[PDB]
Amino acid sequence: MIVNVIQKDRLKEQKLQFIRNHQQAFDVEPIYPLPLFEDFVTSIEGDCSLEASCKIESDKLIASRFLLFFEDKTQEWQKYLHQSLTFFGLVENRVGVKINYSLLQQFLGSSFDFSKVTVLSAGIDLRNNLAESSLKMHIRIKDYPEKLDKAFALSDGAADGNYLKDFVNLIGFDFYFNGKSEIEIYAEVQEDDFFKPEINNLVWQHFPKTALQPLKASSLFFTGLSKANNNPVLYYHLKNRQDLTNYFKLNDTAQRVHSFYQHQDILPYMWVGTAQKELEKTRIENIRLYYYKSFKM
């Protein structure tokens, strides 16, 4: 029991430390209402991971981006969903806003089978312009064609975007403080399938050659299907964070983030998000960089 109490206190502080290291590097003052998210992550006592992210738009650095992944081995997905939604409710109460839950409600709608969930996340992207701040949730489903269809119906709709339907497992939800909400579906290719002839035919053929180069350093590739008809956002799961500069042509602002994280006590892998057109450039101007740390008993 004494072991358990010490570990719990330690995990609480390590989570706050990871959040504070990120915030203090990039924002002299924390963006309101970050402490609410801090309270949320410290309330999650089972195993989890945290994500800290920067979104770069030329010289603009957006850095109050944090996400928790529920990783407790018991996989009580409905409980974590309820914990996340209660946190969303506290944000609503404190800030004085009403969140638009309709897309999530419709997704869950008809008798949701939580045994089909494999990933659940909850987090924030906070801005000084309240209306542009958002809450975030991702749900990964496995062997659930009914809910894949539903997510597709909820997003943009018919072909194309439909051309990568059979590759979708992750669904994302954004909930803006102004009452606007969005859904996104993500097509994926895992490492073991990169060189399969059908994958070149179904996937790689429809992307420029520059899009294919970071796959050498990646274990996973995602693309967002509903937003931006041309110029989709491409996501790369780099096995080693050190490989970023070898595969992506970073501007000054993104270099600063990369430099900060090179020698932080974080997980070796990262995610990199960038629009297709950016990889065709001599220099990336718009990029998302995601860093991770695990918190286990």
Ligand X SMILES: CC(C)=CCSP(=O)(O)OP(=O)(O)O
Binding-site residue positions for Mg(2+):
125, 184
Q: What are phi and psi of 58, to 5 degrees?
A: 55, -110
End-to-end distance of the chain based on CA atoms, in angstroms? 13
Q: How far is the CB of 197 from ligand X (least distance, A)?
A: 26
Q: Does residue 248 bind ligand X (CB under 6 A)?
A: no
Q: Does residue 293 bind ligand X (CB under 6 A)?
A: no
Binding residues: 125, 184
The residue sitting closest to ligand X, measured at its beta carbon, is 235
Beta strands 270-275 and 286-295, pairing class:
antiparallel
Enter the tokens of residue 199: 């994958």
Q: Which residues pair with 275 in a beta bridge?
A: 233
- Taking the least distance from each CB to ligand X, the nearer of 11 and 173 is 173
How far apart are alpha carbons 88 and 109 in whole angstroms? 19
- Per-residue x/- marks for ligand X, 50-89, CB under 6 A? -----x----------------------------------
Q: How far is the CB of 128 from ligand X (least distance, A)?
A: 16
Under a CB-based contact definition with an 8 Å cutoff, are residues 87 and 103 in contact? no
Q: Does residue 285 bind ligand X (CB under 6 A)?
A: no
Contacts with ligand X in 250-279 (CB under 6 A)? 271, 273
> Sign of dihedral through CA atoms 147, 269, 62, 188?
negative
Ranges of H-type helices in the chain = 2-26, 34-43, 77-95, 102-108, 145-154, 197-202, 209-212, 244-247, 252-261, 276-280
Q: How far is CA 105 from the centre of its chain?
A: 20
Q: How far is the CB of 186 from ligand X (least distance, A)?
A: 6
Q: How far is the CB of 4 from ligand X (least distance, A)?
A: 33
Q: Does residue 292 bind ligand X (CB under 6 A)?
A: no
- Taking the least distance from each CB to ligand X, the nearer of 107 and 235 is 235
Burial 97-126, CB ≥16 within 10 A → b, else e: bebeeebbeebbeeebebeebebbbbbbbb
Q: How far is the CB of 174 from ligand X (least distance, A)?
A: 7
Q: How far is the CB of 39 from ligand X (least distance, A)?
A: 22
SS3 of residue 196 by DSSP: coil
* 97 CB-side CA count, 13 A: 21
- Taking the least distance from each CB to ligand X, the nearer of 11 and 250 is 250
- Taking the least distance from each CB to ligand X, the nearer of 41 and 124 is 124
- Taking the least distance from each CB to ligand X, the nearer of 11 and 67 is 67
- Per-residue x/- marks for ligand X, 175-204, CB under 6 A? ---------x-x------------------
Which one among 18, 26, 56, 172 touches ligand X, defined by CB under 6 A? 172
Which one among 26, 87, 235, 291 touches ligand X, defined by CB under 6 A? 235
**What residue ranges bind ligand X (CB under 6 A)?**
55, 125, 136, 172, 184, 186, 222, 235, 271, 273, 288
